[PDB]
Design an enzyme around this catalytic site. Structure first.
Site, PDB file in Angstrom:
ATOM      1  N   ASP A  43     -11.873 -13.219   1.888  1.00 49.32           N
ATOM      2  CA  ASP A  43     -12.708 -11.773   1.200  1.00 49.32           C
ATOM      3  C   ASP A  43     -12.870 -11.036   2.525  1.00 49.32           C
ATOM      4  O   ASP A  43     -11.945 -10.429   3.331  1.00 49.32           O
ATOM      5  CB  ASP A  43     -13.412 -13.214   2.524  1.00 49.32           C
ATOM      6  CG  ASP A  43     -14.967 -12.503   2.091  1.00 49.32           C
ATOM      7  OD1 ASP A  43     -15.857 -12.314   1.025  1.00 49.32           O
ATOM      8  OD2 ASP A  43     -15.861 -11.119   3.167  1.00 49.32           O
ATOM      9  N   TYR A  48     -14.423  -2.401   4.968  1.00 46.36           N
ATOM     10  CA  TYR A  48     -13.127  -3.535   6.120  1.00 46.36           C
ATOM     11  C   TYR A  48     -11.767  -2.407   6.555  1.00 46.36           C
ATOM     12  O   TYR A  48     -11.460  -2.781   7.311  1.00 46.36           O
ATOM     13  CB  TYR A  48     -13.021  -4.570   5.619  1.00 46.36           C
ATOM     14  CG  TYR A  48     -14.205  -5.256   6.240  1.00 46.36           C
ATOM     15  CD1 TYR A  48     -14.975  -5.160   5.793  1.00 46.36           C
ATOM     16  CD2 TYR A  48     -13.630  -6.831   5.096  1.00 46.36           C
ATOM     17  CE1 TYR A  48     -16.326  -5.922   5.619  1.00 46.36           C
ATOM     18  CE2 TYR A  48     -14.732  -7.547   4.462  1.00 46.36           C
ATOM     19  CZ  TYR A  48     -15.896  -7.090   5.249  1.00 46.36           C
ATOM     20  OH  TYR A  48     -17.546  -8.354   4.656  1.00 46.36           O
ATOM     21  N   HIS A 110     -22.177  -5.579  -1.859  1.00 44.58           N
ATOM     22  CA  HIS A 110     -22.553  -5.255  -0.197  1.00 44.58           C
ATOM     23  C   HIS A 110     -23.975  -5.536  -0.034  1.00 44.58           C
ATOM     24  O   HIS A 110     -24.232  -6.548   1.277  1.00 44.58           O
ATOM     25  CB  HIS A 110     -21.712  -4.502   0.712  1.00 44.58           C
ATOM     26  CG  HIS A 110     -20.917  -5.077   2.172  1.00 44.58           C
ATOM     27  ND1 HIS A 110     -19.723  -4.528   2.395  1.00 44.58           N
ATOM     28  CD2 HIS A 110     -21.823  -6.155   2.488  1.00 44.58           C
ATOM     29  CE1 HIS A 110     -19.371  -4.853   2.503  1.00 44.58           C
ATOM     30  NE2 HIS A 110     -20.441  -6.043   3.742  1.00 44.58           N
TER      31      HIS A 110
HETATM   32  N1  LIG Z   1     -21.808  -8.222   4.868  1.00 42.69           N
HETATM   33  C1  LIG Z   1     -21.242  -9.567   4.337  1.00 42.69           C
HETATM   34  O1  LIG Z   1     -21.148  -9.486   3.600  1.00 42.69           O
HETATM   35  C2  LIG Z   1     -20.369  -9.384   6.007  1.00 42.69           C
HETATM   36  C3  LIG Z   1     -19.965 -10.924   5.289  1.00 42.69           C
HETATM   37  N2  LIG Z   1     -18.529 -10.885   6.595  1.00 42.69           N
HETATM   38  C4  LIG Z   1     -16.999 -12.441   5.728  1.00 42.69           C
HETATM   39  O2  LIG Z   1     -17.455 -13.014   6.509  1.00 42.69           O
HETATM   40  C5  LIG Z   1     -16.274 -13.244   7.917  1.00 42.69           C
HETATM   41  C6  LIG Z   1     -16.775 -13.956   9.040  1.00 42.69           C
HETATM   42  O3  LIG Z   1     -17.803 -13.809   9.636  1.00 42.69           O
HETATM   43  P1  LIG Z   1     -17.115 -12.622  10.771  1.00 42.69           P
HETATM   44  O4  LIG Z   1     -18.056 -11.816  11.409  1.00 42.69           O
HETATM   45  O5  LIG Z   1     -15.600 -11.652  10.690  1.00 42.69           O
HETATM   46  O6  LIG Z   1     -16.932 -13.236  11.503  1.00 42.69           O
HETATM   47  P2  LIG Z   1     -16.299 -15.094  12.275  1.00 42.69           P
HETATM   48  O7  LIG Z   1     -18.036 -16.360  12.525  1.00 42.69           O
HETATM   49  O8  LIG Z   1     -15.486 -16.065  10.982  1.00 42.69           O
HETATM   50  O9  LIG Z   1     -15.446 -15.495  13.408  1.00 42.69           O
HETATM   51  C7  LIG Z   1     -14.546 -15.222  13.319  1.00 42.69           C
HETATM   52  C8  LIG Z   1     -14.331 -14.767  14.996  1.00 42.69           C
HETATM   53  O10 LIG Z   1     -14.070 -16.012  15.373  1.00 42.69           O
HETATM   54  C9  LIG Z   1     -12.982 -16.127  15.881  1.00 42.69           C
HETATM   55  N3  LIG Z   1     -12.627 -17.391  15.772  1.00 42.69           N
HETATM   56  C10 LIG Z   1     -12.022 -17.670  14.404  1.00 42.69           C
HETATM   57  N4  LIG Z   1     -11.629 -19.161  14.276  1.00 42.69           N
HETATM   58  C11 LIG Z   1     -11.933 -19.466  15.939  1.00 42.69           C
HETATM   59  C12 LIG Z   1     -11.819 -20.968  15.811  1.00 42.69           C
HETATM   60  N5  LIG Z   1     -11.205 -22.051  15.367  1.00 42.69           N
HETATM   61  N6  LIG Z   1     -12.443 -20.912  17.412  1.00 42.69           N
HETATM   62  C13 LIG Z   1     -12.295 -19.837  18.152  1.00 42.69           C
HETATM   63  N7  LIG Z   1     -12.654 -18.733  17.639  1.00 42.69           N
HETATM   64  C14 LIG Z   1     -12.031 -18.804  16.285  1.00 42.69           C
HETATM   65  C15 LIG Z   1     -12.073 -15.057  15.814  1.00 42.69           C
HETATM   66  O11 LIG Z   1     -10.971 -14.451  16.942  1.00 42.69           O
HETATM   67  P3  LIG Z   1      -9.156 -15.015  15.957  1.00 42.69           P
HETATM   68  O12 LIG Z   1      -9.599 -13.024  15.265  1.00 42.69           O
HETATM   69  O13 LIG Z   1      -8.658 -14.118  17.481  1.00 42.69           O
HETATM   70  O14 LIG Z   1      -9.348 -15.568  16.270  1.00 42.69           O
HETATM   71  C16 LIG Z   1     -13.014 -13.818  15.441  1.00 42.69           C
HETATM   72  O15 LIG Z   1     -13.519 -13.058  16.991  1.00 42.69           O
HETATM   73  C17 LIG Z   1     -15.576 -11.714   7.526  1.00 42.69           C
HETATM   74  O16 LIG Z   1     -14.400 -11.324   8.512  1.00 42.69           O
HETATM   75  C18 LIG Z   1     -15.993 -10.993   6.005  1.00 42.69           C
HETATM   76  O17 LIG Z   1     -14.922 -11.495   5.211  1.00 42.69           O
HETATM   77  C19 LIG Z   1     -19.033 -10.891   7.788  1.00 42.69           C
HETATM   78  C20 LIG Z   1     -20.004  -9.924   8.354  1.00 42.69           C
HETATM   79  C21 LIG Z   1     -20.659  -9.286   6.806  1.00 42.69           C
END
Ligand SMILES: NC(=O)C1=CN([C@@H]2O[C@H](COP(=O)(O)OP(=O)(O)OC[C@H]3O[C@@H](n4cnc5c(N)ncnc54)[C@H](OP(=O)(O)O)[C@@H]3O)[C@@H](O)[C@H]2O)C=CC1
Length: 309
Positions: A43, A48, A110
Protein backbone atom coordinates in the site's frame (compact mmCIF):
# COMPACT_ATOMS: atom_id res chain seq x y z
CA UNK A 1 -8.27 -17.24 3.25
CA UNK A 2 -5.26 -15.26 1.83
CA UNK A 3 -7.25 -13.04 -0.63
CA UNK A 4 -10.59 -11.26 -1.08
CA UNK A 5 -12.35 -10.75 -4.42
CA UNK A 6 -13.03 -7.25 -5.78
CA UNK A 7 -16.08 -6.32 -7.94
CA UNK A 8 -13.55 -6.13 -10.89
CA UNK A 9 -12.91 -9.93 -10.49
CA UNK A 10 -9.33 -9.25 -9.24
CA UNK A 11 -7.99 -10.88 -6.04
CA UNK A 12 -6.65 -8.53 -3.34
CA UNK A 13 -4.21 -10.24 -0.92
CA UNK A 14 -5.71 -10.02 2.62
CA UNK A 15 -2.46 -8.59 4.06
CA UNK A 16 -0.62 -5.63 2.48
CA UNK A 17 2.54 -3.87 3.69
CA UNK A 18 1.76 -0.31 4.89
CA UNK A 19 4.38 2.28 3.82
CA UNK A 20 3.17 5.44 5.57
CA UNK A 21 6.17 6.73 7.64
CA UNK A 22 8.51 4.13 6.06
CA UNK A 23 11.32 6.64 5.38
CA UNK A 24 13.11 6.40 1.98
CA UNK A 25 16.25 4.90 3.62
CA UNK A 26 14.37 1.86 5.13
CA UNK A 27 11.26 1.29 2.90
CA UNK A 28 13.23 -0.67 0.21
CA UNK A 29 14.50 -3.44 2.54
CA UNK A 30 11.02 -3.57 4.24
CA UNK A 31 9.26 -4.17 0.86
CA UNK A 32 12.00 -6.64 -0.28
CA UNK A 33 11.84 -8.60 3.04
CA UNK A 34 8.01 -8.47 3.14
CA UNK A 35 7.61 -9.96 -0.41
CA UNK A 36 10.35 -12.59 0.22
CA UNK A 37 8.37 -13.49 3.40
CA UNK A 38 5.17 -14.01 1.28
CA UNK A 39 3.52 -10.51 1.07
CA UNK A 40 1.85 -9.95 -2.33
CA UNK A 41 0.32 -6.49 -1.57
CA UNK A 42 2.05 -3.08 -0.99
CA UNK A 43 0.00 0.00 0.00
CA UNK A 44 1.61 3.23 -1.32
CA UNK A 45 0.86 6.95 -1.83
CA UNK A 46 2.67 9.84 -3.56
CA UNK A 47 2.25 11.81 -0.32
CA UNK A 48 4.26 9.15 1.65
CA UNK A 49 7.39 10.51 -0.18
CA UNK A 50 8.92 7.05 -0.78
CA UNK A 51 7.43 5.62 -4.01
CA UNK A 52 10.81 5.88 -5.89
CA UNK A 53 12.48 3.66 -3.20
CA UNK A 54 9.50 1.26 -3.30
CA UNK A 55 9.96 1.10 -7.13
CA UNK A 56 13.68 0.26 -6.65
CA UNK A 57 12.73 -2.63 -4.22
CA UNK A 58 10.01 -3.97 -6.64
CA UNK A 59 12.58 -3.83 -9.51
CA UNK A 60 15.07 -5.85 -7.34
CA UNK A 61 12.33 -8.41 -6.45
CA UNK A 62 11.46 -8.85 -10.18
CA UNK A 63 15.15 -8.99 -11.30
CA UNK A 64 15.99 -11.63 -8.61
CA UNK A 65 12.90 -13.62 -9.64
CA UNK A 66 11.28 -13.48 -6.14
CA UNK A 67 7.94 -12.70 -7.86
CA UNK A 68 6.60 -11.55 -11.23
CA UNK A 69 4.61 -8.30 -11.58
CA UNK A 70 1.34 -10.29 -11.94
CA UNK A 71 1.92 -11.90 -8.46
CA UNK A 72 1.84 -8.44 -6.70
CA UNK A 73 -1.03 -6.09 -5.77
CA UNK A 74 0.27 -2.48 -5.73
CA UNK A 75 -1.95 0.39 -4.52
CA UNK A 76 -1.35 4.12 -4.77
CA UNK A 77 -3.54 7.15 -4.09
CA UNK A 78 -4.51 10.44 -5.78
CA UNK A 79 -3.54 13.29 -3.45
CA UNK A 80 -6.01 16.07 -2.50
CA UNK A 81 -4.29 18.61 -4.86
CA UNK A 82 -4.80 16.40 -8.02
CA UNK A 83 -8.65 16.23 -8.00
CA UNK A 84 -9.06 18.34 -11.20
CA UNK A 85 -10.07 15.78 -13.89
CA UNK A 86 -7.20 16.85 -16.19
CA UNK A 87 -4.76 16.33 -13.24
CA UNK A 88 -5.82 12.73 -12.33
CA UNK A 89 -4.12 10.75 -15.17
CA UNK A 90 -0.91 12.87 -14.78
CA UNK A 91 -0.79 12.06 -11.01
CA UNK A 92 -1.31 8.32 -11.77
CA UNK A 93 1.50 8.50 -14.39
CA UNK A 94 3.81 10.18 -11.80
CA UNK A 95 3.26 7.23 -9.36
CA UNK A 96 3.65 4.65 -12.21
CA UNK A 97 6.96 6.35 -13.14
CA UNK A 98 8.27 6.42 -9.52
CA UNK A 99 7.12 2.82 -8.78
CA UNK A 100 8.52 1.85 -12.27
CA UNK A 101 5.25 -0.05 -13.02
CA UNK A 102 3.10 -0.12 -16.18
CA UNK A 103 -0.14 -0.41 -14.14
CA UNK A 104 -1.41 -0.21 -10.54
CA UNK A 105 -3.71 -2.94 -9.18
CA UNK A 106 -5.60 -0.13 -7.32
CA UNK A 107 -5.70 3.69 -7.49
CA UNK A 108 -7.72 5.42 -4.76
CA UNK A 109 -9.04 8.93 -4.24
CA UNK A 110 -7.02 9.53 -1.02
CA UNK A 111 -9.68 11.80 0.65
CA UNK A 112 -13.09 13.30 -0.22
CA UNK A 113 -11.16 16.59 0.08
CA UNK A 114 -9.56 18.95 -2.45
CA UNK A 115 -6.95 21.74 -2.47
CA UNK A 116 -5.57 23.85 -5.36
CA UNK A 117 -3.05 21.99 -7.49
CA UNK A 118 0.55 22.28 -6.18
CA UNK A 119 -0.41 24.07 -2.95
CA UNK A 120 0.14 23.19 0.72
CA UNK A 121 -2.56 22.06 3.22
CA UNK A 122 -3.74 25.51 4.50
CA UNK A 123 -7.34 26.76 4.53
CA UNK A 124 -6.98 29.40 1.73
CA UNK A 125 -6.07 26.49 -0.65
CA UNK A 126 -9.32 24.53 0.05
CA UNK A 127 -11.46 24.02 -3.12
CA UNK A 128 -15.03 22.53 -3.12
CA UNK A 129 -14.62 18.82 -4.05
CA UNK A 130 -16.14 17.65 -7.35
CA UNK A 131 -15.95 13.88 -6.60
CA UNK A 132 -18.09 12.90 -9.65
CA UNK A 133 -15.72 14.77 -12.06
CA UNK A 134 -12.61 13.31 -10.27
CA UNK A 135 -14.16 9.80 -10.37
CA UNK A 136 -14.92 10.29 -14.11
CA UNK A 137 -11.16 10.85 -14.68
CA UNK A 138 -10.43 7.77 -12.42
CA UNK A 139 -12.81 5.72 -14.66
CA UNK A 140 -10.75 6.68 -17.81
CA UNK A 141 -7.58 5.47 -15.94
CA UNK A 142 -9.49 2.17 -15.36
CA UNK A 143 -10.62 1.96 -19.06
CA UNK A 144 -6.89 2.47 -20.00
CA UNK A 145 -5.83 -0.46 -17.74
CA UNK A 146 -3.37 1.92 -15.98
CA UNK A 147 -5.39 1.35 -12.77
CA UNK A 148 -6.81 -2.21 -12.97
CA UNK A 149 -9.10 -1.25 -10.07
CA UNK A 150 -10.10 2.24 -8.87
CA UNK A 151 -11.48 3.09 -5.44
CA UNK A 152 -11.77 5.62 -2.64
CA UNK A 153 -10.38 6.11 0.86
CA UNK A 154 -11.85 7.93 3.88
CA UNK A 155 -15.38 7.82 2.32
CA UNK A 156 -18.29 7.42 4.80
CA UNK A 157 -21.10 5.00 3.76
CA UNK A 158 -23.09 8.16 2.76
CA UNK A 159 -20.33 9.55 0.48
CA UNK A 160 -19.60 6.03 -0.91
CA UNK A 161 -23.34 5.60 -1.77
CA UNK A 162 -23.52 9.11 -3.34
CA UNK A 163 -20.56 8.11 -5.63
CA UNK A 164 -21.92 4.55 -6.42
CA UNK A 165 -25.14 6.24 -7.70
CA UNK A 166 -23.26 8.09 -10.55
CA UNK A 167 -20.30 5.67 -11.13
CA UNK A 168 -20.13 3.73 -14.40
CA UNK A 169 -17.25 1.77 -12.70
CA UNK A 170 -18.13 1.16 -9.05
CA UNK A 171 -15.36 1.83 -6.49
CA UNK A 172 -13.65 -1.55 -5.88
CA UNK A 173 -12.36 -0.50 -2.42
CA UNK A 174 -13.07 1.99 0.36
CA UNK A 175 -9.80 2.08 2.40
CA UNK A 176 -10.66 3.35 5.91
CA UNK A 177 -9.35 3.31 9.45
CA UNK A 178 -10.51 -0.04 10.84
CA UNK A 179 -9.22 -2.01 13.87
CA UNK A 180 -10.60 -3.29 17.22
CA UNK A 181 -10.83 0.38 18.45
CA UNK A 182 -12.83 1.51 15.38
CA UNK A 183 -14.83 -1.42 13.97
CA UNK A 184 -16.77 0.48 11.20
CA UNK A 185 -19.85 -1.81 11.44
CA UNK A 186 -22.08 0.55 9.36
CA UNK A 187 -19.57 0.88 6.48
CA UNK A 188 -18.71 -2.86 6.80
CA UNK A 189 -22.42 -3.72 6.19
CA UNK A 190 -22.74 -1.04 3.46
CA UNK A 191 -19.63 -2.34 1.60
CA UNK A 192 -20.92 -6.01 1.88
CA UNK A 193 -24.33 -4.86 0.48
CA UNK A 194 -22.82 -2.90 -2.50
CA UNK A 195 -19.91 -5.34 -3.29
CA UNK A 196 -17.30 -2.71 -2.34
CA UNK A 197 -14.22 -4.15 -0.56
CA UNK A 198 -13.21 -2.59 2.81
CA UNK A 199 -9.43 -2.34 3.31
CA UNK A 200 -8.47 -1.60 6.91
CA UNK A 201 -5.73 1.07 7.28
CA UNK A 202 -4.01 1.60 10.68
CA UNK A 203 -5.08 -2.00 11.61
CA UNK A 204 -2.82 -1.94 14.74
CA UNK A 205 -4.13 1.57 15.58
CA UNK A 206 -0.86 3.18 14.26
CA UNK A 207 1.00 2.95 17.64
CA UNK A 208 4.03 4.70 16.07
CA UNK A 209 1.92 7.88 15.39
CA UNK A 210 1.51 9.76 18.74
CA UNK A 211 -0.90 12.44 17.35
CA UNK A 212 -3.32 9.55 16.48
CA UNK A 213 -3.57 8.60 20.23
CA UNK A 214 -3.96 4.81 19.44
CA UNK A 215 -3.97 2.20 22.29
CA UNK A 216 -5.34 -0.82 20.35
CA UNK A 217 -2.56 -3.35 21.22
CA UNK A 218 -2.87 -2.40 24.96
CA UNK A 219 -6.68 -3.17 25.01
CA UNK A 220 -7.41 -5.73 27.80
CA UNK A 221 -9.71 -7.71 25.41
CA UNK A 222 -6.85 -7.92 22.81
CA UNK A 223 -4.19 -8.82 25.45
CA UNK A 224 -6.60 -11.48 26.91
CA UNK A 225 -7.40 -13.16 23.52
CA UNK A 226 -3.66 -13.02 22.57
CA UNK A 227 -2.75 -14.77 25.85
CA UNK A 228 -5.65 -17.28 25.46
CA UNK A 229 -4.68 -18.21 21.82
CA UNK A 230 -0.83 -18.00 22.19
CA UNK A 231 -0.71 -15.11 19.63
CA UNK A 232 0.62 -11.51 19.84
CA UNK A 233 -1.85 -8.61 20.38
CA UNK A 234 -0.94 -7.51 16.76
CA UNK A 235 -1.79 -10.98 15.41
CA UNK A 236 -5.19 -10.85 17.23
CA UNK A 237 -5.96 -7.31 15.91
CA UNK A 238 -5.05 -8.34 12.30
CA UNK A 239 -6.90 -11.69 12.41
CA UNK A 240 -10.08 -9.90 13.73
CA UNK A 241 -10.11 -7.67 10.61
CA UNK A 242 -9.47 -10.66 8.29
CA UNK A 243 -12.44 -12.59 9.91
CA UNK A 244 -14.65 -9.49 9.16
CA UNK A 245 -13.69 -9.93 5.44
CA UNK A 246 -11.35 -6.86 5.48
CA UNK A 247 -7.86 -6.64 3.99
CA UNK A 248 -5.31 -5.16 6.45
CA UNK A 249 -2.27 -2.90 5.76
CA UNK A 250 0.07 -3.45 8.77
CA UNK A 251 3.09 -1.13 8.45
CA UNK A 252 6.51 -2.41 9.65
CA UNK A 253 10.18 -1.93 8.69
CA UNK A 254 11.17 -4.68 11.23
CA UNK A 255 11.76 -8.16 9.69
CA UNK A 256 10.35 -10.11 12.74
CA UNK A 257 7.15 -7.95 12.93
CA UNK A 258 6.80 -8.07 9.08
CA UNK A 259 6.75 -11.90 9.36
CA UNK A 260 4.43 -11.99 12.42
CA UNK A 261 1.97 -9.62 10.60
CA UNK A 262 1.57 -12.23 7.79
CA UNK A 263 1.05 -15.11 10.34
CA UNK A 264 -2.75 -14.51 10.42
CA UNK A 265 -4.03 -17.30 8.14
CA UNK A 266 -3.58 -20.84 9.63
CA UNK A 267 -5.42 -20.08 12.96
CA UNK A 268 -8.73 -18.34 13.94
CA UNK A 269 -10.35 -16.33 16.76
CA UNK A 270 -13.09 -18.63 18.15
CA UNK A 271 -16.66 -17.14 17.94
CA UNK A 272 -16.81 -16.81 21.77
CA UNK A 273 -13.67 -14.61 21.79
CA UNK A 274 -14.99 -12.62 18.74
CA UNK A 275 -17.95 -11.72 21.06
CA UNK A 276 -15.46 -9.91 23.46
CA UNK A 277 -14.67 -7.21 20.76
CA UNK A 278 -18.06 -5.68 21.94
CA UNK A 279 -16.31 -4.57 25.19
CA UNK A 280 -13.69 -2.39 23.39
CA UNK A 281 -14.39 1.39 23.66
CA UNK A 282 -14.65 2.86 20.10
CA UNK A 283 -12.75 6.02 19.02
CA UNK A 284 -11.63 7.19 15.56
CA UNK A 285 -7.88 7.84 15.73
CA UNK A 286 -7.40 9.59 12.33
CA UNK A 287 -10.04 12.32 12.67
CA UNK A 288 -9.07 14.70 9.80
CA UNK A 289 -8.77 17.69 12.24
CA UNK A 290 -6.86 19.73 9.58
CA UNK A 291 -9.71 19.51 6.94
CA UNK A 292 -12.59 20.34 9.36
CA UNK A 293 -12.62 24.12 9.41
CA UNK A 294 -14.93 27.12 8.63
CA UNK A 295 -13.03 27.42 5.26
CA UNK A 296 -13.76 23.66 4.61
CA UNK A 297 -16.84 22.02 2.99
CA UNK A 298 -16.62 20.03 6.30
CA UNK A 299 -17.39 22.61 9.02
CA UNK A 300 -17.67 19.73 11.60
CA UNK A 301 -16.26 16.16 12.07
CA UNK A 302 -19.93 14.98 11.65
CA UNK A 303 -20.02 16.55 8.13
CA UNK A 304 -16.70 14.86 7.11
CA UNK A 305 -17.59 11.38 8.51
CA UNK A 306 -21.45 11.60 8.22
CA UNK A 307 -21.96 10.65 11.93
CA UNK A 308 -20.55 7.07 11.83
CA UNK A 309 -20.15 5.24 15.25
N1 LIG B 1 -5.74 7.74 4.51
C1 LIG B 1 -5.37 6.51 4.21
O1 LIG B 1 -5.82 5.87 3.23
C2 LIG B 1 -4.40 5.91 5.16
C3 LIG B 1 -3.70 4.82 4.80
N2 LIG B 1 -2.89 4.13 5.66
C4 LIG B 1 -2.16 2.90 5.20
O2 LIG B 1 -2.31 1.93 6.21
C5 LIG B 1 -1.00 1.53 6.69
C6 LIG B 1 -1.08 1.01 8.10
O3 LIG B 1 -1.49 2.06 8.99
P1 LIG B 1 -0.38 2.83 9.85
O4 LIG B 1 -1.03 4.07 10.33
O5 LIG B 1 0.93 2.86 9.14
O6 LIG B 1 -0.24 1.96 11.18
P2 LIG B 1 -0.35 0.44 11.70
O7 LIG B 1 -1.62 0.31 12.44
O8 LIG B 1 0.01 -0.53 10.61
O9 LIG B 1 0.84 0.44 12.78
C7 LIG B 1 2.17 0.66 12.38
C8 LIG B 1 3.01 0.76 13.63
O10 LIG B 1 2.94 -0.49 14.36
C9 LIG B 1 4.24 -1.04 14.50
N3 LIG B 1 4.10 -2.48 14.34
C10 LIG B 1 4.00 -3.17 13.16
N4 LIG B 1 3.87 -4.45 13.34
C11 LIG B 1 3.83 -4.62 14.72
C12 LIG B 1 3.69 -5.77 15.54
N5 LIG B 1 3.52 -7.00 15.07
N6 LIG B 1 3.70 -5.59 16.89
C13 LIG B 1 3.85 -4.34 17.37
N7 LIG B 1 4.01 -3.20 16.70
C14 LIG B 1 3.99 -3.41 15.36
C15 LIG B 1 5.13 -0.34 13.47
O11 LIG B 1 6.48 -0.26 13.97
P3 LIG B 1 7.65 -1.03 13.17
O12 LIG B 1 7.76 -0.42 11.84
O13 LIG B 1 8.84 -0.76 14.07
O14 LIG B 1 7.33 -2.49 13.17
C16 LIG B 1 4.50 1.04 13.41
O15 LIG B 1 4.92 1.86 14.48
C17 LIG B 1 -0.12 2.75 6.42
O16 LIG B 1 1.27 2.50 6.54
C18 LIG B 1 -0.64 3.11 5.02
O17 LIG B 1 -0.11 2.28 3.99
C19 LIG B 1 -2.75 4.58 6.93
C20 LIG B 1 -3.37 5.65 7.34
C21 LIG B 1 -4.13 6.51 6.45
Amino acid sequence: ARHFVLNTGAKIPSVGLGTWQSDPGVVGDAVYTAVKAGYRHIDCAKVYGNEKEIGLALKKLFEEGVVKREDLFITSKLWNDRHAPEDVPEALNESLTDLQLDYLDLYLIHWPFRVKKGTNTSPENFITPDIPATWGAMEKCYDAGKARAIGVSNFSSKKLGDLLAVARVHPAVDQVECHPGWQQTKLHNFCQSTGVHLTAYSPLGSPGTTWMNGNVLKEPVIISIAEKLGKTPAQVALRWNIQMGHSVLPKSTNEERIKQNLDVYDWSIPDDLLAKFSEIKQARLLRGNDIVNPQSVYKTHEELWDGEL
